[PDB]
Design an enzyme around this catalytic site. Structure first.
Site, PDB file in Angstrom:
ATOM      1  N   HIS A  62       1.073  -0.863  -0.381  1.00 40.62           N
ATOM      2  CA  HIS A  62      -0.082   0.015   0.089  1.00 40.62           C
ATOM      3  C   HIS A  62       0.935   0.987  -0.290  1.00 40.62           C
ATOM      4  O   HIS A  62       0.757   2.547  -0.329  1.00 40.62           O
ATOM      5  CB  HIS A  62      -1.149   0.075   0.936  1.00 40.62           C
ATOM      6  N   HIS A  92       6.782   7.419   5.781  1.00 39.34           N
ATOM      7  CA  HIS A  92       6.401   6.701   4.717  1.00 39.34           C
ATOM      8  C   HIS A  92       4.816   8.185   3.555  1.00 39.34           C
ATOM      9  O   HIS A  92       5.529   9.012   4.631  1.00 39.34           O
ATOM     10  CB  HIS A  92       4.533   5.340   3.847  1.00 39.34           C
ATOM     11  N   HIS A  94       2.306   9.451   0.363  1.00 30.16           N
ATOM     12  CA  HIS A  94       0.464   9.227   0.190  1.00 30.16           C
ATOM     13  C   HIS A  94       0.738  10.155  -0.978  1.00 30.16           C
ATOM     14  O   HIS A  94       1.624  11.030  -0.705  1.00 30.16           O
ATOM     15  CB  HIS A  94      -0.430   9.719   0.894  1.00 30.16           C
ATOM     16  N   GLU A 104      -3.239  13.204   1.456  1.00 31.16           N
ATOM     17  CA  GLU A 104      -4.256  13.436   2.158  1.00 31.16           C
ATOM     18  C   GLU A 104      -4.956  14.578   2.734  1.00 31.16           C
ATOM     19  O   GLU A 104      -6.724  14.941   2.352  1.00 31.16           O
ATOM     20  CB  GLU A 104      -4.366  12.017   3.286  1.00 31.16           C
ATOM     21  N   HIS A 117       4.231  11.231   5.588  1.00 30.92           N
ATOM     22  CA  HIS A 117       3.889  10.763   7.095  1.00 30.92           C
ATOM     23  C   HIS A 117       4.942   9.976   8.070  1.00 30.92           C
ATOM     24  O   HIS A 117       6.402   9.333   7.522  1.00 30.92           O
ATOM     25  CB  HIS A 117       2.846  10.206   7.574  1.00 30.92           C
ATOM     26  N   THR A 196      -5.322   6.965   8.695  1.00 33.40           N
ATOM     27  CA  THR A 196      -5.647   6.496   7.399  1.00 33.40           C
ATOM     28  C   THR A 196      -6.108   5.900   6.406  1.00 33.40           C
ATOM     29  O   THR A 196      -6.274   5.713   5.126  1.00 33.40           O
ATOM     30  CB  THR A 196      -4.638   8.543   6.075  1.00 33.40           C
ATOM     31  N   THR A 197      -5.296   4.491   7.222  1.00 30.69           N
ATOM     32  CA  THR A 197      -5.334   2.884   6.165  1.00 30.69           C
ATOM     33  C   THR A 197      -6.147   2.682   7.353  1.00 30.69           C
ATOM     34  O   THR A 197      -5.731   2.226   8.985  1.00 30.69           O
ATOM     35  CB  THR A 197      -4.007   2.986   6.163  1.00 30.69           C
TER      36      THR A 197
HETATM   37 ZN   LIG Z   1       0.256   8.110   5.916  1.00 27.73          ZN
END
Ligand SMILES: [Zn+2]
EC number: 4.2.1.1
Length: 258
Positions: A62, A92, A94, A104, A117, A196-197
């Protein structure tokens, strides 16, 4: 089947397996700059990453995580709106399929090309797994990325992506200094939110920096070359692994600046 970011398993479907997705303190949110309340009682952030020990980089299907040794107080965050010491576990990103989307959090509805993040867990809980079960278990620093000039400190990351192209691949990734990823200013917005996941636990104090860092077009292009799939499976590029803004509900966004 399992969650992801496609049409059939994307953010709009998460609630079926993770009911907390429609919770009262879900992330990300849109930051309305005229409604955020300046709070002069908030202290400046304290980022002590000089002893950071990175270990590895992994493609988890992901995103890609850079993991750090969190067995001791080597890379910590404190101050700001936090009580106690938070140890960095991993960072990580996004990102999007195009430069006009990827972050995000949004600012006055503006989307950035990506969002970094830095994930930290509250040491009073003893380990990461215990920390996710508490309302103040994690602190996540979020940094927006805009496309412009290259970020020199990001190149080491960019260069190793070829070796972790598909899900489940990992590579040794030592002596990386995350200080090379910070903007000049540490001014920020803060609110109580979630991961957020999946599992979307409401255990995060978000710390979003006002100042974005720039990356070159070429650096972001390399992100878009990763894959969601595992080796020998049909190719699905790792793009648009961002969750859309959620309702603020009963929450106030505070600012460290005016
Ligand atoms: Zn994140």
């Amino acid at each position: 089947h399992h969650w992801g970011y496609g049409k059939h398993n994307g953010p709009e479907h998460w609630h079926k397996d993770f009911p907390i997705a429609k919770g009262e303190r879900q992330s990300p949110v849109d930051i309305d700059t005229h409604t955020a309340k300046y709070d002069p009682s908030l202290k400046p952030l304290s980022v002590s990453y000089d002893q950071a020990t990175s270990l590895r980089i992994l493609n988890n299907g992901h995103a890609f995580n850079v993991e750090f040794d969190d067995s001791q107080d080597k890379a910590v965050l404190k101050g700001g709106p936090l009580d106690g010491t938070y140890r960095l576990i991993q960072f990580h990103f996004h990102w999007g399929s195009l430069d006009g989307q990827g972050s995000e959090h949004t600012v006055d509805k503006k989307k950035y090309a990506a969002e970094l993040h830095l994930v930290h867990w509250n040491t009073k809980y003893g380990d990461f797994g215990k920390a996710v079960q508490q309302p103040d278990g994690l602190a996540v620093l979020g940094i927006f990325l805009k496309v412009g000039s290259a970020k020199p400190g990001l190149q080491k990351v960019v260069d190793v992506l070829d070796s972790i192209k598909t899900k489940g691949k990992s590579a040794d990734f030592t002596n990386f200094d995350p200080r090379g990823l910070l903007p000049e200013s540490l001014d920020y917005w803060t609110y109580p939110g979630s991961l957020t996941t999946p599992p979307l636990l409401e255990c995060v104090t978000w710390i979003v920096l006002k100042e974005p860092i720039s990356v070159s077009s070429e650096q972001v292009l390399k992100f878009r070359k990763l894959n969601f799939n595992g080796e020998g499976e049909p190719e699905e590029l790792m793009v648009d692994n961002w969750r859309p803004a959620q309702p603020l509900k009963n929450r106030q966004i505070k600012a460290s600046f005016k």
